[PDB]
């Protein structure tokens, strides 16, 4: 298969990973001053949704870094496992997590479309329609938490609002039922 | 991280600390003659608000000197703790007080923005959003008093007015309920 198209794809993935990380950092700083505005100005719940979007983004940041490590370590053993024909256990975790998150990351990046195709084009043993679904069970559970879509515990969203109000110097009063939870 | 940008930042912090200390001293002398005017001229309560601003400033002066000692002692062990990766107990008090007062001092100085970022960039153990909030509990309580925003006891504001009237030779009569308090 097109393994150097795959490789330069990965390189662009890494480049855009860095770029998107940086851009989202920038706008996240602006948005944190903005959240200081919303919290300072009335609807802390509006700021609560804003910071929900932000903590979502931060889950994405952490997941981005984890998978950046994964694509880079897979890139290390390009020719080596390319000599092989099945995936090894040393890369089974990375491959499983990547295969699992790839559909979640299909939209975020178009290179990864080809990266996943070439992955599945690379293997059939524990690879394919369901065989890939069988081998993908070794996905990183930590990334899974960093890729879980949920409301954080309102004690923790309150703590994010508290540490924001700390860092950004607004008055925040958590809901004591949740501030105790 | 940018630890020499941090270092020259600290140097500018110290320079402006000295400069602002000197400037506020100068204008405070002028303002003390001015307070002698207001006390001499009618509204001692107007002078009372003026000297409230001044004693506030003096709390800032004392806090400035304390933290000047703190930044300089941290500067002593720049490379040493830089070799380390977590903060030591020998600097835990200074770091906690600095981290705690930094948001209060965010506005006073723009270098300290970076100084706090690099601080948090220096550590994660008892550092971060709430971990830094956890480790900051070792702040100087004396500085905390020198950084507490409160009305002094009116026996003491009366004593400041009395010792001003002493030094500046105006007639001051404290409110005997407070002059006894």
Swiss-Prot record, chains A, B:
The modification Phosphotyrosine is found at residue 38. It is found in: Cytoplasmic vesicle; Cytoplasm, Cytoskeleton, Microtubule organizing center, Centrosome; Midbody; Nucleus envelope. Residues 1-163 are annotated as: Interaction with CHMP1A and CHMP1B. ESCRT-III-like protein involved in cytokinesis, nuclear envelope reassembly and endosomal tubulation. Is required for efficient abscission during cytokinesis. Involved in recruiting VPS4A and/or VPS4B to the midbody of dividing cells. During late anaphase, involved in nuclear envelope reassembly and mitotic spindle disassembly together with the ESCRT-III complex: IST1 acts by mediating the recruitment of SPAST to the nuclear membrane, leading to microtubule severing. Recruited to the reforming nuclear envelope (NE) during anaphase by LEMD2. Belongs to the IST1 family. Interacts with CHMP1A, CHMP1B, VPS4A and VTA1. Interacts with SPAST, STAMBP, and USP8. May interact with VPS37B. May associate with the ESCRT-I complex. Interacts with MITD1, in competition with VSP4. Interacts with SPART (via MIT domain); leading to the recruitment of SPART to midbodies. Interacts with SPAST. This is IST1 homolog. It comes from Homo sapiens (Human).
